[PDB]
């Protein structure tokens, strides 16, 4: 690309969505150390934010970071498809969320709880510390808990 320069400008390590993000990684991937931002999500969000992915987490204006967040937590508004999203069709309000960061933990809790509370086999199965997607349990996973 090009031999670059800058000064004190870029500060290593920076904190968004209640987590931490290393500088000196290629930004797209920096965003990944947040919960709920697989490489795709990050990629598209960054493209939508109008950022140079060739940049590290390193550079990036404060502004830029702000936009990045805004879109990250309002995908549907900044035309991101919705099949791109980890939580479409809630199951109560039925909206589509892309649940992020410290909140995806909650949402997992929530769902598992709903299953348990309703006595559904999947729930019981979870509660029992077993595999739920129907795999044979004779042979695999014995290192286990």
């Amino acid at each position: 690309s090009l031999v670059v320069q800058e000064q004190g400008s870029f500060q290593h390590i920076l904190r968004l969505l209640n987590t931490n993000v290393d500088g000196n990684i290629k930004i797209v991937y920096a965003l990944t150390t947040i919960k709920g931002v697989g490489r795709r999500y990050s990629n598209l969000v960054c493209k939508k934010a109008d950022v140079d992915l060739h940049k590290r987490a390193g550079e990036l204006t404060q502004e830029e970071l702000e936009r990045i967040v805004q879109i990250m937590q309002n995908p549907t508004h900044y035309k991101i498809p919705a099949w791109f999203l980890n939580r479409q069709n809630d199951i109560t309000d039925g909206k589509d969320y892309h649940t992020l960061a410290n909140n995806v933990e909650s949402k997992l809790r929530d769902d598992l709880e709903r299953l348990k509370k309703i006595r559904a086999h999947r729930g019981i199965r979870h509660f029992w510390g077993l595999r739920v997607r129907g795999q044979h349990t004779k042979t695999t996973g014995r290192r286990r808990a």
Partner: protein
């Protein structure tokens, strides 16, 4: 993490005054000179060829190779 991902002006000048005697320069050599990781070191490869020192004698992905200018 362990370093060489930016440019620290002193580093740039370092690159300009350290790259003769390097009969061999490549992605690997630049890293080995305790600096630039294979991202920005590739840029260094493109940009010493901006004009000067490095003489392109081999071609591609993975392998690059240059020699001191004459």
């Amino acid at each position: 993490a362990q370093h060489a991902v930016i440019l620290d002006q002193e580093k740039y000048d370092r690159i300009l005054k350290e790259v003769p005697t390097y009969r061999y320069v490549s992605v690997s050599v630049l890293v080995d000179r305790l600096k630039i990781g294979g991202s920005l070191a590739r840029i260094a490869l493109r940009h010493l060829e901006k004009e000067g020192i490095i003489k392109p004698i081999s071609k591609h992905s993975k392998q690059a190779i240059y020699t001191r200018a004459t």
